[PDB]
Amino acid sequence: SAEKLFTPLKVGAVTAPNRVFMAPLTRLRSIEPGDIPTPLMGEYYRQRASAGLIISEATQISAQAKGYAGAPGLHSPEQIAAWKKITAGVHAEDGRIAVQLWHTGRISHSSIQPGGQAPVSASALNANTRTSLRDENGNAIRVDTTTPRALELDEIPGIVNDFRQAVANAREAGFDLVELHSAHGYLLHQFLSPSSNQRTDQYGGSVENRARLVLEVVDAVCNEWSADRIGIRVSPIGTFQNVDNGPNEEADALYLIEELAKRGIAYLHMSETDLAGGKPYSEAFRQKVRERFHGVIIGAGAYTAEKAEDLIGKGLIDAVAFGRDYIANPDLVARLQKKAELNPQRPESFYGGGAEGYTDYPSL
């Protein structure tokens, strides 16, 4: 029956009935041209509406933000209209959903950028990894990332504004909250990490400079909507998609969190490790984070229900976001509550394709 995973939690402007959240999961099944959400995607989210909180797959704040074929956007009328149906479906089932907004930065390819030009980032350094495009038959394919163009100083205000606008669109689209994707090596993290940021202006160098952009974004969206509607996901400890967190990751992470706390935002979502290995968070560190943020804290990364109960019981985190278990178990809440077995995962269909391996996993 579990001790606390199934107890309500106030998350900013809304209230989750349980602490089992669905982590943001890129599935690359949107319509192109237009990067438009689909009815199928609506069904997928609706099947998982019993989650304490649904965090959508990463969504573009602009066309320039696009880095993967099939990923949705929230910048055009068509996209807004499609998302409105998806949030309505979730609400029809009494669920809550937040839209994760990102700008992929250097984790992109020129073929899917506006005008077919090079993607942008903090510096002109290749991410040295690959992204997902679609072939002539619409099938997902891996391709090496394009070397980025360093953003000009006078272009940064435009970036902040795209985030601001997307949040405004998210509000009209019916989303309950918004989660800024400031992790996993995407644009915001590109600026935060010294390994990917070699700028010599006020957006590079010190942690204060490196964190400038993300903080300007946080202030802009808090002003556009409301601080209790804002969430942010970070992955400040370890290495992700080739972007590490610098020689003083812990101290830099604590600085960022204290700054975020000043805005009084809804929640802090901590992605502890990427899909590959990663040194685990020490309780000492969890305590330092805990005492610096006064909003909800969500833990994530290969979590087990037992680990969730342990850390929530110790009062270190408030909720847990499950990724892969949610892909395969729409009614994960009921299964964890009843201690039932889960459906096996089918990794080959995580990205692209159709209903198979998407709205395919049965509920109890």
Ligand SMILES: Cc1cc2nc3c(=O)[nH]c(=O)nc-3n(C[C@H](O)[C@H](O)[C@H](O)COP(=O)(O)O)c2cc1C
């Ligand atoms: C197919 C797939 C897509 C993902 N897409 C995103 C994404 O868009 N944004 C994000 O922040 N994390 C993303 N993640 C990371 C997950 O949110 C999560 O942190 C990760 O899967 C670890 O949790 P798990 O062990 O419970 O699956 C993705 C993971 C998978 C497996």
Ligand SMILES: C[C@]12C=CC(=O)C=C1CC[C@@H]1[C@@H]2CC[C@]2(C)C(=O)CC[C@@H]12
């Ligand atoms: C899991 C992930 C990580 C962090 C994040 O924020 C969002 C995603 C979704 C896309 C995958 C990426 C990891 C790298 C992947 C597997 C590739 O090489 C192609 C598809 C990518």
